[PDB]
Structure formats: structure tokens, C-alpha cells
Ligand binder design. Sequence first.
Ligand code: MYA
Ligand code: 9M2
Ligand code: MG
Length: 411
Amino acid sequence: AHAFWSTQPVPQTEDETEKIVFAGPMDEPKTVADIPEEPYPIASTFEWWTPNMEAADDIHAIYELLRDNYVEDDDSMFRFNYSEEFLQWALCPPNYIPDWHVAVRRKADKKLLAFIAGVPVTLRMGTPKYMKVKAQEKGEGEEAAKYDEPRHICEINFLCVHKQLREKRLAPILIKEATRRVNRTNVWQAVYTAGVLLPTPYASGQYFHRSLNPEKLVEIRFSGIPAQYQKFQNPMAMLKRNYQLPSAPKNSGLREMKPSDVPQVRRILMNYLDSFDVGPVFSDAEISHYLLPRDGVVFTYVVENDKKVTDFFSFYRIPSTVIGNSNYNLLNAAYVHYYAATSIPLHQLILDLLIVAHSRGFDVCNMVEILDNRSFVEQLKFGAGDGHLRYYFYNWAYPKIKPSQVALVML
Ligand SMILES: CCCCCCCCCCCCCC(=O)SCCNC(=O)CCNC(=O)[C@H](O)C(C)(C)COP(=O)(O)OP(=O)(O)OC[C@H]1O[C@@H](n2cnc3c(N)ncnc32)[C@H](O)[C@@H]1OP(=O)(O)O
Ligand SMILES: Cc1nn(C)c(C)c1CCOc1cc(F)ccc1-c1ccc2n[nH]c(CN(C)C)c2c1
Ligand SMILES: [Mg+2]
């Protein structure tokens, strides 16, 4: 049933994943010398291209492919519209490898037909907490702890085939070529997320939304009006009142993060993330990259009293195109990013995030139920949405974990 994925070093069934007891590789061990320097074969009317992700024209090419042909929601009403600036942020973190940005162009007219990108990530992906107990009783602790150290691996994202080339088995070719490029640098595992079920996720979480601008959400059909509110003279005023927020946070100490905050943010972030089974390890340079504010892209605030940072939150922007002819409505969505609370309950910190996002003109706040995200759903009036984000590894056997054991936000 999976002509491509049955050929690949990933768990092949759910049952397989449920029985895995230790973290570890799946494939035969290999050296760089084992991997071909010649690119993967592709039909003669097409060519590999490595866009320069800092060149204006290349980023613009990638932007338009994704704007027109990237992820749509489960109901085909919205499509992600990542900005050019967001793409350069997401794809060019510290020590990124330009060669991991892979495109296919038609030779004759240089039309961009497809894309996939890897970026480096340092990830903790050793045997979980619940799995280390069972292997202690059994005394097999060394096998279970063999891969505890954070590993320098690849994060895959932005796989896209042009709408007009769908179902032609081009996606497997991009994946093989990415894999080859990555293997050439002596990296053997990858992590990826998708809203579709593939063989075979190690974790899966529902996404959740919090209305900030209900009127717009109803107009573009993201939301409907609650039946219960339909029973009133002004259903929309009821709905607006429900989701209404303060115009500013009464949380004293909140300000935008700045460069001087990088070390303390790193410390409080890493202290928190280290409590989850699967999670990133960030250098100072990576904290800087992913969390320092960038206009229209990433927004990050710290609670600081007397030059001591005790809490922070971050969110990023991806607007969704509202699909339709001559429809210029944009769902301007804020996504919950990393955060850490030490001085205030997490729900108070995230209320501040909703307040700020609403102030900055966001229509909705979205998140997946990873981290401690479920702990503030009800009070902050999040609801579950119709999608699920599944988490996968390539060439890594991993026992099934709950999404609340996952600490990697994928963009
Ligand atoms: C060590 C280094 C390793 C690095 C790589 C690690 C793995 C990387 C894995 C990639 C992680 C990406 C992370 C993200 O970016 S998730 C974002 C995915 N992008 C989109 O959804 C954008 C809109 N859709 C499209 O552009 C196309 O429909 C895509 C490109 C998704 C498929 O193109 P198309 O529809 O024209 O199909 P095909 O005939 O060429 O190919 C059919 C095969 O493709 C398998 N398929 C379908 N969707 C996905 C998907 N999201 N991940 C993995 N595989 C997928 C499918 O099961 C089938 O295989 P099999 O079922 O027959 O076996
Ligand atoms: C709104 C809206 N617009 N669009 C286009 C969707 C799919 C939605 C539903 C909300 O979806 C989400 C809401 C969240 F809070 C977080 C994640 C998603 C989401 C869903 C499916 C995806 N497939 N590929 C990616 C990109 N990357 C993570 C690999 C996805 C991201
Ligand atoms: Mg295809």
C-alpha cells in the first residue's frame, strides 16, 4: 500500500512502533564513501537546482511555489502563505547547509516544479522516561541509554510538488535526493511532521485554535456561530464578547526580548525542555536566531524585573490564503512557539500572548497539543480543530509517546 515508504528505513506499522523498547537506528550502518556523489536520476526534461536562500530572486521563486501549491487545511478552504522573510528565517538558521535546500526545475523554461528543505537540528531523541523504567527491571539499561546524548540531525520541511505535477511520483524522488545530500554530510537521521498519516508516527497531536477576531473568522468560514448564541438577538455580539480580551497585558514586567536576554532565555528554556522525552538543544546563536523578534515573522516577550528574566513566550506568523477567486482575505494566524514560565502560572503567561497577538492584529492563535499546551486550553478558550500533526523520524526506531512528551515546535 506504500510503494515508496515500504522501501525506507522507518517503522512500517503501528504495532511495530508500539513494541519498540529502545531508541536507535534502523538501517544498515554506512559511511559517506558508501553514498553516491552523483545526484539521484531524474527525467531529462528536469534538473536539480540548489536555490541560494539569501538571493532575492531565488527566495521569490520558492515563495511563489509555496503560496500557490503548499499545505491546505483538511477542508481545502485555506492554504499556507509563508512570507519570503519567514522562509529565509526558517531555512537559514546557524550553520545551515545550503546543499540541503533542494529544488526541481523544468529545463526548458526554468519553471520551479518542486522543493524540499532540510536544516540542522540538535535533538534529544534517546529512549523515553516510561521506557527506561521497564528496561531497568529487565536490567538492559545500557542498550536503553546508548543514544541519550543529543544528536546533530536533519529537520525536513517545505516538501512541495506543483499542483500540475501531482501523483507522478516526484515526491519520492525529492526525498531520496535530500536523503543522499544529508547522508553525504555523515548525518543519518531526520525528524519531520505532517498533517497526513504516513508510516509511522512516534507521536500525534490535535491542533487547537483560539479566536481573536471572531467576526473575520466567521466571514472567511474558519468559524461558525455557536448554536447557543444563535438563540439571541445579536449572536455576533455574544460571540465577540466571549472572545474579548484586554487591549494590553496587566502583567507587569513584559517587554520584547532583546539580544542581552539571550543567555537567560536559553537557560530557562533548556531547563524546561529537558523535562520532555524529545526536544531540541539550542546554542546561544540558535536562541538568538529562533527567538529574537523579527518584524512580521517571530514575536517574543520576556517578563523581566530588575534585569532578571523569569519568563518568556514566543509566537510566529503564518497567514493563510483564503482560497477563492478574487478573495484577498487572509487568515492572519499566530502560532504558539517556545515559552517558559517560572514566576507566573503558564495560563497567565499565555493569556499575555493572546493579548499581544490580538493587539498586533492577529485573527486566531493556533497550536498543537505538545509541551504543556493542553494545560491552558479550557480557561483560555482554545478549541480543538479538525487537523492532527503527526511526528516522524527517518532511520530511527522510537517507542510511541504522547504529544505532551514532545518539545520540538516545527514551523
Ligand atoms: C537522513 C536524511 C533523511 C531526510 C528525509 C527524511 C524523510 C522526509 C519525508 C518528507 C517530510 C516532509 C515534511 C513536510 O514538508 S509536510 C508538508 C507536505 N507538503 C504538502 O502537503 C504540500 C501540498 N502537497 C504536495 O505538495 C504534494 O501532495 C506532496 C509533495 C506532499 C506529495 O506529492 P504528490 O501528492 O504529487 O505524490 P507523489 O505521487 O509525488 O508521491 C506519493 C508518495 O508521497 C508520499 N507522501 C505524500 N505526502 C507526503 C508527505 N507530506 N510527506 C512524506 N511523504 C508523503 C505518499 O505517501 C506516497 O508514498 P507511498 O505511500 O506510495 O509510499
Ligand atoms: C489555519 C490553517 N491553514 N492551513 C493551511 C492549515 C493546514 C490550517 C490548520 C491548522 O494547522 C496547524 C495548526 C497548528 F497549530 C500547527 C500546525 C498546523 C499544520 C497542519 C498540517 C500541516 N502540514 N504541514 C505543515 C507544516 N509543517 C508543520 C510541517 C502543517 C501544519
Ligand atoms: Mg508527483
